[PDB]
Design a protein around this ligand. Structure first.
Ligand SMILES: CCCCCCCCCCCCCCCCCCC(=O)O
Length: 162
């Protein structure tokens, strides 16, 4: 609920398939600065269940190499918001998507201390999409980000964007 842009009328079935993590931003540099930083995750695929939960396939660098990870995001009463559960119960919020080209999401830790908030611009192809990046940057202008990364088409085709 730090982020107050939410996709009205989200049809979670339609975000299925392959995505590319074109850009990332976080409120804390340490969340994204190294290959093995904790929210440096490269989205591969979204797999919505029939009950409306969301299976997530991603990569993450750990122990000197690019590892595949599977993650379950459970639905809530709000169609745009999901919970990772696991250790801290992180919420994931879909800000905006048009399903066939881009999707903007943010995630926050359900409490703090020092605020942890990270967002991504996903796109459907290995292409720099200026319009989506522009919407991403607009979405974030009033959020307190201190690190922003983006990736070139070559990196997007490589595991962990190396
Ligand atoms: C509805 C659109 C939603 C798309 C965006 C997905 C959001 C990704 C959130 C990723 C945070 C989790 C941090 C990485 C944990 C590694 C995994 C450890 C393991 O299970 O072995």
């Amino acid at each position: 609920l730090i982020v107050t842009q939410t996709m009205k009328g989200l049809d979670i079935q339609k975000v299925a398939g392959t995505w590319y993590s074109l850009a990332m931003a976080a409120s804390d540099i340490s969340l994204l600065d190294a290959q093995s930083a904790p929210l440096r995750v490269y989205v591969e695929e979204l797999k919505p269940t029939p009950e409306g939960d969301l299976e997530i396939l991603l990569q993450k660098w750990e122990n000197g190499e690019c590892a595949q990870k599977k993650i379950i995001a459970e639905k809530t009463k709000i169609p745009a918001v999901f919970k990772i559960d696991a250790l801290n119960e992180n919420k994931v919020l879909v800000l905006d998507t048009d399903y066939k080209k881009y999707l903007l999401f943010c995630m926050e830790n359900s409490a703090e201390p020092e605020q942890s908030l990270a967002c991504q611009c996903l796109v459907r192809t290995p292409e720099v999409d200026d319009e989506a990046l522009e919407k991403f940057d607009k979405a974030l202008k009033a959020l307190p980000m201190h690190i922003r990364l983006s990736f070139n088409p070559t990196q997007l085709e490589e595991q962990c964007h190396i």
